[PDB]
Design a protein around this motif. Structure first.
Motif, PDB file in Angstrom:
ATOM      1  N   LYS A 290       3.172  11.365  27.193  1.00 51.62           N
ATOM      2  CA  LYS A 290       2.992  11.968  25.958  1.00 51.62           C
ATOM      3  C   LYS A 290       1.794  12.991  25.568  1.00 51.62           C
ATOM      4  CE  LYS A 290       6.408   9.554  24.062  1.00 51.62           C
ATOM      5  NZ  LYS A 290       6.499   9.360  22.560  1.00 51.62           N
ATOM      6  N   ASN A 291       0.858  12.888  26.618  1.00 53.81           N
ATOM      7  CA  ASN A 291      -0.355  13.524  26.442  1.00 53.81           C
ATOM      8  C   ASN A 291      -1.541  13.351  27.362  1.00 53.81           C
ATOM      9  OD1 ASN A 291      -2.315  11.575  25.689  1.00 53.81           O
ATOM     10  ND2 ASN A 291      -1.212  11.758  23.507  1.00 53.81           N
ATOM     11  N   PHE A 292      -2.517  14.321  27.161  1.00 55.68           N
ATOM     12  CA  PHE A 292      -3.672  14.115  28.277  1.00 55.68           C
ATOM     13  C   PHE A 292      -4.742  13.812  27.300  1.00 55.68           C
ATOM     14  CE2 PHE A 292      -6.945  16.130  30.957  1.00 55.68           C
ATOM     15  CZ  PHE A 292      -6.919  15.024  31.723  1.00 55.68           C
ATOM     16  N   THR A 293      -5.818  12.813  27.719  1.00 57.18           N
ATOM     17  CA  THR A 293      -6.814  12.213  27.110  1.00 57.18           C
ATOM     18  C   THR A 293      -8.024  12.519  27.752  1.00 57.18           C
ATOM     19  OG1 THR A 293      -5.285  10.722  25.759  1.00 57.18           O
ATOM     20  CG2 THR A 293      -7.816  10.429  25.646  1.00 57.18           C
ATOM     21  N   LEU A 294      -9.034  13.076  27.308  1.00 57.52           N
ATOM     22  CA  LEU A 294     -10.524  13.135  27.711  1.00 57.52           C
ATOM     23  C   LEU A 294     -11.388  12.513  26.641  1.00 57.52           C
ATOM     24  CD1 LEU A 294     -10.484  17.040  28.401  1.00 57.52           C
ATOM     25  CD2 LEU A 294     -10.111  15.216  30.136  1.00 57.52           C
ATOM     26  N   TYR A 295     -12.369  11.950  27.401  1.00 54.62           N
ATOM     27  CA  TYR A 295     -13.541  11.029  26.697  1.00 54.62           C
ATOM     28  C   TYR A 295     -14.838  11.974  27.357  1.00 54.62           C
ATOM     29  CZ  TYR A 295     -10.120   7.620  25.602  1.00 54.62           C
ATOM     30  OH  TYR A 295      -9.125   6.918  25.194  1.00 54.62           O
ATOM     31  N   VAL A 296     -15.337  12.758  26.222  1.00 56.97           N
ATOM     32  CA  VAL A 296     -16.450  13.695  26.517  1.00 56.97           C
ATOM     33  C   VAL A 296     -17.869  13.165  25.861  1.00 56.97           C
ATOM     34  CG1 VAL A 296     -14.667  15.286  27.091  1.00 56.97           C
ATOM     35  CG2 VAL A 296     -16.215  15.519  24.887  1.00 56.97           C
ATOM     36  N   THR A 297     -18.798  13.801  26.132  1.00 56.54           N
ATOM     37  CA  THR A 297     -20.230  13.595  25.618  1.00 56.54           C
ATOM     38  C   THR A 297     -21.157  14.864  26.103  1.00 56.54           C
ATOM     39  OG1 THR A 297     -21.931  12.240  25.610  1.00 56.54           O
ATOM     40  CG2 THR A 297     -21.112  12.457  27.461  1.00 56.54           C
ATOM     41  N   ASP A 298     -21.909  15.001  25.011  1.00 61.44           N
ATOM     42  CA  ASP A 298     -23.312  15.966  25.391  1.00 61.44           C
ATOM     43  C   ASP A 298     -24.316  15.241  25.221  1.00 61.44           C
ATOM     44  OD1 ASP A 298     -23.538  15.761  22.652  1.00 61.44           O
ATOM     45  OD2 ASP A 298     -23.344  17.969  22.342  1.00 61.44           O
ATOM     46  N   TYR A 299     -24.363  13.844  25.386  1.00 56.82           N
ATOM     47  CA  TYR A 299     -25.528  13.097  25.185  1.00 56.82           C
ATOM     48  C   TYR A 299     -26.114  13.108  23.757  1.00 56.82           C
ATOM     49  CZ  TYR A 299     -24.441  11.450  29.862  1.00 56.82           C
ATOM     50  OH  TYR A 299     -23.835  10.971  30.855  1.00 56.82           O
ATOM     51  N   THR A 300     -25.653  13.278  22.749  1.00 56.95           N
ATOM     52  CA  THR A 300     -26.148  13.370  21.372  1.00 56.95           C
ATOM     53  C   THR A 300     -25.091  12.620  20.635  1.00 56.95           C
ATOM     54  OG1 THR A 300     -24.794  15.418  20.614  1.00 56.95           O
ATOM     55  CG2 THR A 300     -26.923  15.791  21.435  1.00 56.95           C
ATOM     56  N   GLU A 301     -25.947  11.943  19.519  1.00 60.52           N
ATOM     57  CA  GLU A 301     -24.925  10.753  19.059  1.00 60.52           C
ATOM     58  C   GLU A 301     -24.499  11.358  17.572  1.00 60.52           C
ATOM     59  OE1 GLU A 301     -26.976   6.932  18.349  1.00 60.52           O
ATOM     60  OE2 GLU A 301     -26.729   6.899  16.058  1.00 60.52           O
TER      61      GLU A 301
ATOM     62  N   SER B 174     -19.845   9.473  22.774  1.00 59.84           N
ATOM     63  CA  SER B 174     -18.511  10.276  23.336  1.00 59.84           C
ATOM     64  C   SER B 174     -17.621  10.280  22.260  1.00 59.84           C
ATOM     65  CB  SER B 174     -18.354   9.402  24.518  1.00 59.84           C
ATOM     66  OG  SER B 174     -19.214   9.208  25.396  1.00 59.84           O
ATOM     67  N   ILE B 175     -16.910  11.180  22.624  1.00 61.45           N
ATOM     68  CA  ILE B 175     -15.651  11.372  21.505  1.00 61.45           C
ATOM     69  C   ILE B 175     -14.315  11.715  22.349  1.00 61.45           C
ATOM     70  CG2 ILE B 175     -15.740  13.946  21.628  1.00 61.45           C
ATOM     71  CD1 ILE B 175     -15.052  14.109  18.767  1.00 61.45           C
ATOM     72  N   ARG B 176     -13.410  10.929  21.921  1.00 64.19           N
ATOM     73  CA  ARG B 176     -11.943  11.180  22.423  1.00 64.19           C
ATOM     74  C   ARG B 176     -11.195  12.607  22.261  1.00 64.19           C
ATOM     75  NH1 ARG B 176      -9.016   6.586  20.390  1.00 64.19           N
ATOM     76  NH2 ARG B 176      -8.788   7.699  18.570  1.00 64.19           N
ATOM     77  N   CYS B 177     -10.618  13.257  22.959  1.00 62.77           N
ATOM     78  CA  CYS B 177      -9.972  14.525  22.828  1.00 62.77           C
ATOM     79  C   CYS B 177      -8.496  14.263  23.308  1.00 62.77           C
ATOM     80  CB  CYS B 177     -10.609  15.743  23.508  1.00 62.77           C
ATOM     81  SG  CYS B 177     -12.516  15.766  23.468  1.00 62.77           S
ATOM     82  N   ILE B 178      -7.655  14.683  22.378  1.00 63.03           N
ATOM     83  CA  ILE B 178      -6.153  14.285  22.645  1.00 63.03           C
ATOM     84  C   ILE B 178      -5.729  15.951  22.940  1.00 63.03           C
ATOM     85  CG2 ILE B 178      -3.904  13.468  22.190  1.00 63.03           C
ATOM     86  CD1 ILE B 178      -6.174  11.473  22.558  1.00 63.03           C
ATOM     87  N   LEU B 179      -4.890  16.052  24.151  1.00 66.25           N
ATOM     88  CA  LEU B 179      -4.715  17.553  24.363  1.00 66.25           C
ATOM     89  C   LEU B 179      -3.157  17.304  24.732  1.00 66.25           C
ATOM     90  CD1 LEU B 179      -7.580  17.733  25.448  1.00 66.25           C
ATOM     91  CD2 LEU B 179      -6.875  19.013  27.285  1.00 66.25           C
ATOM     92  N   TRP B 180      -2.341  18.219  23.880  1.00 63.89           N
ATOM     93  CA  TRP B 180      -1.083  18.183  23.958  1.00 63.89           C
ATOM     94  C   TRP B 180      -0.275  19.535  24.465  1.00 63.89           C
ATOM     95  CZ3 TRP B 180      -2.762  15.332  19.240  1.00 63.89           C
ATOM     96  CH2 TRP B 180      -2.106  14.076  19.426  1.00 63.89           C
TER      97      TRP B 180
ATOM     98  N   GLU C  34     -12.298  12.451  16.258  1.00 59.76           N
ATOM     99  CA  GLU C  34     -11.501  12.763  17.643  1.00 59.76           C
ATOM    100  C   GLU C  34     -11.481  14.188  17.536  1.00 59.76           C
ATOM    101  OE1 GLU C  34      -7.875  10.180  18.240  1.00 59.76           O
ATOM    102  OE2 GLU C  34      -7.005  11.326  16.258  1.00 59.76           O
ATOM    103  N   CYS C  35     -11.165  14.769  18.596  1.00 57.55           N
ATOM    104  CA  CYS C  35     -10.900  16.116  18.736  1.00 57.55           C
ATOM    105  C   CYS C  35      -9.511  16.280  19.241  1.00 57.55           C
ATOM    106  CB  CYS C  35     -11.804  16.868  19.739  1.00 57.55           C
ATOM    107  SG  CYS C  35     -13.364  17.090  19.218  1.00 57.55           S
ATOM    108  N   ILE C  36      -8.668  17.296  18.799  1.00 56.21           N
ATOM    109  CA  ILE C  36      -7.353  17.481  18.876  1.00 56.21           C
ATOM    110  C   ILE C  36      -7.088  18.992  19.495  1.00 56.21           C
ATOM    111  CG2 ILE C  36      -4.871  17.460  18.048  1.00 56.21           C
ATOM    112  CD1 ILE C  36      -6.221  14.755  18.171  1.00 56.21           C
ATOM    113  N   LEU C  37      -6.486  18.864  20.566  1.00 49.10           N
ATOM    114  CA  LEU C  37      -5.828  20.381  21.070  1.00 49.10           C
ATOM    115  C   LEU C  37      -4.539  20.213  20.972  1.00 49.10           C
ATOM    116  CD1 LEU C  37      -8.729  20.164  22.834  1.00 49.10           C
ATOM    117  CD2 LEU C  37      -7.948  22.043  23.788  1.00 49.10           C
ATOM    118  N   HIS C  38      -3.703  20.923  19.867  1.00 50.58           N
ATOM    119  CA  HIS C  38      -2.296  20.905  19.653  1.00 50.58           C
ATOM    120  C   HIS C  38      -1.639  21.900  20.159  1.00 50.58           C
ATOM    121  CE1 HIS C  38      -3.083  23.613  16.259  1.00 50.58           C
ATOM    122  NE2 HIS C  38      -4.200  22.923  16.182  1.00 50.58           N
ATOM    123  N   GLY C  39      -0.383  21.975  20.336  1.00 53.15           N
ATOM    124  CA  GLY C  39       0.241  22.906  20.420  1.00 53.15           C
ATOM    125  C   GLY C  39       0.300  24.022  19.793  1.00 53.15           C
ATOM    126  N   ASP C  40       0.002  25.385  20.350  1.00 46.30           N
ATOM    127  CA  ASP C  40      -0.255  26.520  19.570  1.00 46.30           C
ATOM    128  C   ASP C  40       0.196  27.560  20.467  1.00 46.30           C
ATOM    129  OD1 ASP C  40      -1.069  28.490  17.849  1.00 46.30           O
ATOM    130  OD2 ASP C  40      -3.277  28.113  18.097  1.00 46.30           O
TER     131      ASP C  40
END
Length: 141
Positions: A29-40, A64-70, A103-109
């Protein structure tokens, strides 16, 4: 294109930031990233050091935050962005999940309406020095 720290991002806004990829997972269904810049961020999920997969090489707590890429973002990144890589994400959508976490979302554009993007940043780039410095602080503590 002003950049924010992940501690500064809020839901239902567009934001841009640098981060390090902790975890990747692709599905049908998608690609998921979990990312951080070491700030809370108070709205991030509190990652547990007790029940988390032994694989998790990132911070614990709300770091860390989950990013969903579509769609095009999924096809582009799913066999490209690796755990440990650094990324720069631009104009990504933020929202709240069904449980209240940001969460962060990269949706179809396909029309490039929002100029969303994610690109790999070579680890030597000076733009990553603050991430590296906070990781040093985290690990040392």
């Amino acid at each position: 294109d002003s950049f924010s720290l992940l501690s500064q991002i809020t839901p239902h806004q567009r934001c841009s930031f640098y981060a390090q990829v902790i975890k990747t997972w692709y599905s049908d269904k998608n690609f998921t990233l979990y990312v951080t810049d070491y700030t809370e961020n108070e709205l991030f999920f509190p990652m547990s050091p007790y029940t988390s997969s032994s694989r998790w090489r990132g911070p614990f707590g709300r770091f860390s935050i989950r990013c969903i890429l579509w769609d095009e973002h999924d096809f582009y990144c799913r066999n490209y962005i690796k755990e440990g890589d650094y990324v720069v994400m631009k104009n990504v959508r933020t929202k709240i999940d069904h449980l209240g976490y940001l969460e962060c979302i990269l949706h179809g554009d396909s029309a490039k309406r929002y100029n969303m993007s994610i690109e790999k940043v070579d680890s030597e780039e000076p733009e990553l020095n603050e991430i590296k410095s906070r990781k040093r602080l985290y690990v040392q503590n």
